[PDB]
């Protein structure tokens, strides 16, 4: 329940191979032509599916 | 200073066919393990593979002196509790004559990464016909 040996630099770096976070699934808006998330209301032009909300 | 050291791909490696009828299992395997190693060439280099390719035919007619056909046992454990399995030399020669020859020769090769590469160089056939006619192998006579 207590570490027997200290963790080296290589072993501590190998474990953090998977602690990254992925890239957002963003998309180009059809109306205002800038980035937004898919299946989401565009935060700039306030439109979804071509109709203002 | 000045002592010749071979390079990978510098030495020519040949193909051989050896007939394994009537010869003892260990007399043949000792002779073969030196051809794969390359100890018959003055270009021998310990850290380089300079040996030749060997094909063994008629492996089902290998000789077993004395009562070795029934008294010689081959063991095999599967790392499970009570998972030890055994076979006899004579029973394996009838069913798997190829495994008998590769088990004998593999123990006569160095136990490292290079000796694990010389085992990929040996082909054993229980019958009298092989499939490597494209390599044009020669006939090697035992000493």
């Amino acid at each position: 329940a207590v570490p027997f040996r200290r963790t080296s630099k290589a072993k501590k770096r190998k474990r953090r191979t998977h602690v990254k976070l992925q890239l957002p699934g963003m998309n180009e808006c059809s109306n205002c032509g800038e980035y937004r998330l898919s299946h989401h209301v565009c935060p700039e032009c306030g439109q979804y599916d071509g109709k203002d909300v | 200073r000045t002592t010749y050291m071979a390079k990978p791909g510098e030495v020519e490696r040949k193909w051989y066919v050896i007939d394994a009828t009537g010869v003892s299992l260990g007399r043949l395997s000792s002779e073969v393990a030196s051809i794969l190693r390359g100890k018959n060439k003055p270009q021998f280099t310990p850290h380089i593979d300079t040996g030749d390719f060997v094909i063994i035919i008629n492996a089902g007619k290998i000789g077993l002196t004395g009562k070795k056909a029934t008294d010689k046992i081959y063991y095999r454990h599967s790392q499970y509790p009570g998972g030890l399995k055994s076979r006899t030399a004579g029973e394996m020669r009838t069913n798997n004559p190829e495994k008998l020859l590769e088990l004998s020769i593999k123990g006569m090769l160095p136990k490292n990464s290079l000796g694990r590469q010389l085992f990929k160089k040996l082909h054993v056939y229980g019958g009298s016909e092989h499939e490597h006619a494209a390599q044009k192998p020669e006939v090697y006579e035992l000493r």
Partner: protein
């Protein structure tokens, strides 16, 4: 007068970490771990100057043997004939001829073969 311990401790310790260059992990960074890796390397290099002479003679012997068996001779019979006839060439040069100038190696093997036959 007071003698504070400056500028001398670091110079001596850093000279050891420099000798540990190329070692894995902390063996090339920290003094204590690098100090005992340098001492071990000196000990390994001391006795490897002795095995280096053994390693090469085994290579020459196993290489003269291979070339002698192509002339219906063994290494032991070849060595007996050469010493019996009087040739004093050592293993380093007999192995050199067996690889580079195999034509002359057969000349020496003929002298050894004749001396063993009177």
């Amino acid at each position: 007068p007071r003698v504070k311990g400056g500028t001398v401790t670091r110079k001596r310790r850093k000279k050891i970490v420099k000798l540990a260059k190329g070692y894995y992990g902390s063996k090339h960074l920290l003094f204590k771990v690098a100090n005992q890796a340098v001492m071990k390397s000196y000990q390994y290099a001391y006795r490897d100057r002795r095995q280096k002479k053994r390693d090469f003679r085994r290579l020459w012997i196993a290489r003269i043997n291979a070339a002698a068996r192509m002339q219906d001779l063994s290494y032991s019979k070849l060595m007996h004939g050469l010493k019996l006839a009087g040739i004093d060439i050592n293993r380093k040069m007999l192995a050199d001829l067996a690889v580079n100038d195999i034509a002359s190696f057969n000349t020496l093997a003929d002298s050894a073969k004749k001396a063993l036959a009177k």
